[PDB]
C-alpha cells in the first residue's frame, strides 16, 4: 500500500577497547543519501595497556534501519530497510548470562 | 513538503565485555511501533576473568534513525528522526588515535 508522508560524541570510536573507523556510503537515490558505517580497527581488542589482545575480539554492532528510496526513478518513494554497522564491541568466546 | 511513499545474532549482548539488556519501547502511532533499546548491565566492564573492572566503563552506542509517525492522528504520516541505544562498548579515559 501507498501512504502520503510530510518531511523533517564523547569519541568512543577512539576510547573504546574495540575501536573503529567510519567509512562513507553514498547513494543519491536514498534518504539518508550518506551513511557513515563503522569498521573495527582490529581483530582483537586493545587491553588496558594499549596492546592488541587475541583472547578477545572486536565485532561490529549491526542495526536494521528505515531508508527512503527513489522508485525507480524523484517524485514517488519506497520505504526500505537496510543493515548498518554502527560501532564495535569487544567479545570473548564465553557466555556470561 | 509532502512525498507519496509505497511500503515494505552471535549473541554479543552476553559475550561482550560491556554486556547489555534490551528494554522494550512501544508507540502504536510510530513505525516501527516496537523498538528494543540497549541498556548497559554495568558501570565498568567485565575483564577476561568475568569480574567488573572500574579502570574502564560500559557506555551505550546511540544512533539517529528514521521513523514514520501518525499525524496527528492513520492516513497521513510524518517522517521523524529519533535517538536509539543499539548496544554497548567498553571505553577508558584514554584516547588511542
Amino acid at each position, epitope marked *: 500500500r501507498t501512504v502520503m508522508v510530510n518531511l523533517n560524541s564523547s569519541d568512543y570510536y577512539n576510547r573504546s577497547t574495540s575501536p573503529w573507523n567510519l567509512h562513507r556510503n553514498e547513494d543519491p537515490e536514498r534518504y539518508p543519501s550518506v551513511i557513515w558505517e563503522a569498521k573495527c580497527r582490529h581483530l582483537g581488542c586493545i587491553n588496558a595497556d594499549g596492546n592488541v589482545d587475541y583472547h578477545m*575480539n572486536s565485532v561490529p554492532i549491526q542495526q536494521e534501519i528505515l531508508v527512503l528510496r527513489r522508485e525507480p526513478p524523484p517524485n514517488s518513494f519506497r520505504l526500505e530497510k537496510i543493515l548498518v554497522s554502527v560501532g564495535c564491541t569487544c567479545v*570473548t568466546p564465553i557466555v556470561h548470562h | 513538503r509532502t512525498v507519496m511513499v509505497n511500503l515494505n*545474532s*552471535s549473541d554479543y549482548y552476553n*559475550r561482550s565485555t560491556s554486556p547489555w539488556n534490551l528494554h522494550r519501547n512501544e508507540d502504536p502511532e510510530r513505525y516501527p511501533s516496537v523498538i528494543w533499546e540497549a541498556k548497559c548491565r554495568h558501570l565498568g566492564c567485565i575483564n*577476561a*576473568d568475568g569480574n567488573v573492572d572500574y579502570h574502564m566503563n560500559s557506555v551505550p552506542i546511540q544512533q539517529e534513525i528514521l521513523v514514520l509517525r501518525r499525524e496527528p492522528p492513520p492516513n497521513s504520516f510524518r517522517l521523524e528522526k529519533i535517538l536509539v541505544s543499539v548496544g554497548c562498548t567498553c571505553v577508558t579515559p584514554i584516547v588511542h588515535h
Partner: antibody
Amino acid sequence: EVQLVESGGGLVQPGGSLRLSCAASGFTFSNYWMNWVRQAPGKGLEWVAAINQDGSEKYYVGSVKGRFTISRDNAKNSLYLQMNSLRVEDTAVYYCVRDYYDILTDYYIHYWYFDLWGRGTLVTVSS
Amino acid sequence: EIVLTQSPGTLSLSPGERATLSCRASQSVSSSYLAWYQQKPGQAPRLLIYGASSRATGIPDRFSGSGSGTDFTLTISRLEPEDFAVYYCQQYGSSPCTFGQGTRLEIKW
C-alpha cells in the same frame, strides 16, 4: 558416526612453514566453533586458537601471534592452521576439537570445552 | 590467566578402589565452568565431565565430579586397569581457556 581427521603434520627446520588440515564428517560442521589444542611431547595440553561458525571471530594464544592463522572452509567441511616462522617450542601433537553448544530460549550458547577430538597430527620443529 | 594445578602428579591404586583427583585454580572459576578429560596412552582425550559435576554422554556413573571456585575433584570408583590414563581439568569461565598439567593414574596389585 562423528569424526575429525587431521593431516599436514611433519618434520620442519626452525623458521619453516606448515599447514594442518582437519576434515569433519558425521555432523553439521557450520554449527560448531572449532579449536586447535596442542600437546608438546610428554607434556600437557595447551590451547592454540579458536574460530566461530563462520570464521568472523579468530582467537589466539600469545605465543603464536603473527605466526599462526586459524581458518575454515564450511563447504569443504575443513578446519586449517597455517603455521609460519615455526620454532622448536612449537613441537607438539596438534588436535582439532569441536566446541559444545546448547540452544536455550532459542539463543546459540557456545561453551569453550571440547566434546569431540581428532586423533592428532605430529609437528616436529628441529634443525 | 587462570592457572590450574592438579594433584597428585601420579596416583597408584588397586582395582576396585576409589581414585580422587584435585584441580585447584589461582582465581575463582566462574559458574563452575570446569571440565575433565581422560587421555589413555596413545589416544586423543575424551570429555568426562562438564560444569564440574555433569557427566558427558557415554560416561559411566563411577566417574563423578564436584567443586566450585578454586577447588574441584573428579572421583573414579571401581577402578579398572583400563582407567590407566592422564586426567586433565580445563576451565572455560575465563579467557583464555586453560588446562591443568594432568594427573597420571596407574593401577597396581
